[PDB]
Design a protein around this ligand. Structure first.
Ligand code: MG
Length: 299
């Protein structure tokens, strides 16, 4: 079931998946999508956790994308981590959720960290899935992964970027290969992922503004982003998930494991950025162990 909830003057669309056999003290899980502006669709399958673990799972579309209010006329400086933090708490309040687990994927994990560093009273645990701790590290990682590509594929990327011919078929092929190795290794791209991308391309305000149109580097308003100096303030337990071949390489998420006081990590072999799509059952099994551990602690 689904509805909109108020966030200021806007409407945030939420979806609630209830478990078939609700377990005692299994606290609700709020799933944060990435992009930004990608909508919930690509992380829809994480709702399987409701039946698998006996808890309620909540998805929503962050304001400005998907099924929520579109604001193409907002000034560019409207779109900030603080806005989405405020929205998050507005969703929890309207649904009457006091104590909760958060799982965020890509930008969703960045947003998860922004939520956590602020020490909200209701946060029981956070799962950061496939996320960098700074854009600086994210960019360094892109260069490292390009250095690891076959020489032919790297040459096409380097050569066409240098010339500006970034719609040449060689570049398009080489960029798609990078995507298939490091973003989503399932071919064809899962329809849930395609659906996120389609809605974003139809109305790309949030994604274009915050991430930007550049294939490999963030040139949008997130270009300078970092949460590293606030990570010592996280009081919630944190699980850091990444893929073996993730564009979120180990150096990108190292600050989370180095600076968050209560933290552990899990790296999935044979997966990349969209682990939840590439090995859905394995991904959810690891998440389920973490959620359960902290259900018990909260109780
Ligand atoms: Mg404008």
């Amino acid at each position: 079931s689904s509805r909109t909830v108020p966030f200021g003057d806007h409407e945030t669309w939420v979806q609630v998946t209830t478990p078939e056999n609700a377990q005692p003290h299994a606290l609700p899980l709020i799933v944060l999508h990435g992009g930004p502006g990608m909508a919930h669709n690509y992380v829809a399958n994480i709702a399987a956790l409701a039946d698998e673990t006996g808890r309620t799972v909540i998805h929503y579309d962050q304001v400005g994308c998907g099924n929520s209010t579109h604001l193409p006329d907002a000034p560019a400086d409207f779109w900030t981590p603080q806005l989405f933090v405020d929205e998050f708490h507005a969703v929890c309040t309207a649904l009457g959720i006091e104590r909760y687990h958060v799982l965020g994927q890509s930008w969703g994990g960045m947003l998860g960290a922004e939520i956590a560093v602020r020490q909200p009273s209701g946060l029981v645990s956070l799962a950061i899935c496939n996320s960098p701790a700074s854009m600086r590290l994210w960019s360094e990682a892109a260069g490292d992964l390009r250095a690891q590509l076959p020489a032919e594929t790297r040459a096409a990327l380097d050569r066409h970027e240098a010339a500006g011919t970034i719609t040449h078929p060689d570049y398009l092929q080489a960029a798609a290969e990078f995507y298939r190795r490091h973003v989503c290794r399932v071919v064809p791209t899962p329809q849930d992922f395609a659906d996120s991308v389609a809605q974003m391309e139809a109305e790309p305000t949030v994604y274009h503004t915050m991430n930007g149109p550049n294939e490999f580097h963030v040139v949008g308003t997130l270009g300078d982003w970092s949460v590293i100096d606030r990570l010592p303030d996280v009081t919630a337990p944190v699980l850091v998930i990444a893929g073996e071949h993730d564009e979120a390489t180990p150096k990108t998420w190292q600050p989370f494991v180095d600076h968050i006081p209560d933290v552990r990590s899990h790296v999935f072999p044979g997966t990349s950025h969209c682990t939840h799509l590439e090995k859905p059952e394995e991904f959810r099994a690891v998440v389920a162990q973490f959620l359960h551990q902290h259900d018990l602690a909260a109780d």
